[PDB]
Write a protein that binds this ligand. Sequence first.
Ligand SMILES: [Cl-]
Ligand SMILES: [Cl-]
Ligand code: NI
Ligand code: NI
Ligand code: NI
Ligand code: NI
Lengths: 139, 128, 128, 139
Amino acid sequence: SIIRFSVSLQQNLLDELDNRIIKNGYSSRSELVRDMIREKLVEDNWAEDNPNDESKIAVLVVIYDHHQRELNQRMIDIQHASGTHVLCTTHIHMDEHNCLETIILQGNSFEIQRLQLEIGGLRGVKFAKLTKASSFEYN
Amino acid sequence: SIIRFSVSLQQNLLDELDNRIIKNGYSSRSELVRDMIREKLVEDNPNDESKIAVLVVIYDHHQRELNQRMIDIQHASGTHVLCTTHIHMDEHNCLETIILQGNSFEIQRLQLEIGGLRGVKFAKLTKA
Amino acid sequence: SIIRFSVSLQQNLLDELDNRIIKNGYSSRSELVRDMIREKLVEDNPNDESKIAVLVVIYDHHQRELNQRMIDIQHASGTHVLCTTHIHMDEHNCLETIILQGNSFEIQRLQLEIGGLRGVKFAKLTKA
Amino acid sequence: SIIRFSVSLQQNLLDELDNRIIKNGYSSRSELVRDMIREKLVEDNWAEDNPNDESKIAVLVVIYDHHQRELNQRMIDIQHASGTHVLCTTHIHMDEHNCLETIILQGNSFEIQRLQLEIGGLRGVKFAKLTKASSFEYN
Ligand SMILES: [Cl-]
Ligand SMILES: [Cl-]
Ligand code: NI
Ligand code: NI
Ligand code: NI
Ligand code: NI
């Protein structure tokens, strides 16, 4: 695949850019810009997704209080009502108060995003972030 | 302004960039990429504090030695891996979630070196 | 000999026992179960040493509060859970693998209390 | 489901039995015998499995030296040649020398058993045990 093209820009914007490359550990600006583009294309793709398309994949990362009783069940009822399909979940303890969970999800972009918003709103949930992928990155 | 530079991008994703240019009404790549850079700079210390993170990896399951090189890099980075889980997304792809511990330098190194592997189609970090 | 006692067993599995009796040529349940007991006694310290183990659980995914009660029992047992992974085997079942640490008393307690839950269809321990 | 029937036995064999119940933490003999039966029926069922039946599920637990270079690849090539389908794998470090892996497998009983035997034969593999399930336990 890999093809190389050229880009222009405001040498003013470019000092914002070239400082990110430093404090972020990039070898080149070409490398930071690549990543920024890939992200934007993934977001645009999810923005404009149909609902017969239940084929997107994402990972939901949740940190929550695992002595918060019945939180697990609340989380399951929500997932079950959201329309998404959980392919896999992994759970670890981060400490006596906190558990971290990875939930691998299939569905359409808006069921998945909803699931995230509903789960983040639950008492005991301290963190709920979505990793999105699009077909072009891997098909 | 005027400052020209190079960017590499896989055919699939350049197509992707290019249809987005046609859809959304842009007059060039350079113009759309410029707006992407600007948006992502109004969206995007590293330190020695130890954090837990999740690295999500999509990779070609038929790519020989890929797992071995991910394991090598994971020793190279300085992060401690707590758990890895792999599933098949389809005949050509596996998705893996890596739950790990480290400081910001180890972790950022991890995401970047794993990301740059041939066969790795996607490497995205979440830090908590 | 002569010593009679009771055993409970789900309809599915008693059928299972009963066809096995017809297939394999046995004259009664009692006779086949007797051979099973004898074989499993020529096949099958507990101590305070900490071991790593894997508990594999199949359970009904629509059974409300089941996960919560497994989590409660896991605090009840004394074992430390290192990782849990769940997948769907089908619309009615989930399979979970629990990787845990404990002494023989905590672990054995764990397998037994989780096993006895309604909704749990299978609970099998591997100790390493 | 749960139905209760009665069984007879040699009161000599029965002292072997009643001592297991003690040093194993069973509440009753009915409880130990239940488990023994379920196991035996699972083994008999796997013994007499067809090959068009690629629907059995099992969990393979492997402990191995994760500084043993290329062991992972050997393990993947074997799984790929065995005919089985890996639904999910989870890996943790048990120490600097050892990793524990859980591999959730679908296939027929003899592909799965073979995979186990081939993997246990690899240098660096220190433990490779199969948990088997049968349909009657959960369908
Ligand atoms: Cl589901
Ligand atoms: Cl496979
Ligand atoms: Ni469901
Ligand atoms: Ni290591
Ligand atoms: Ni706890
Ligand atoms: Ni494969």
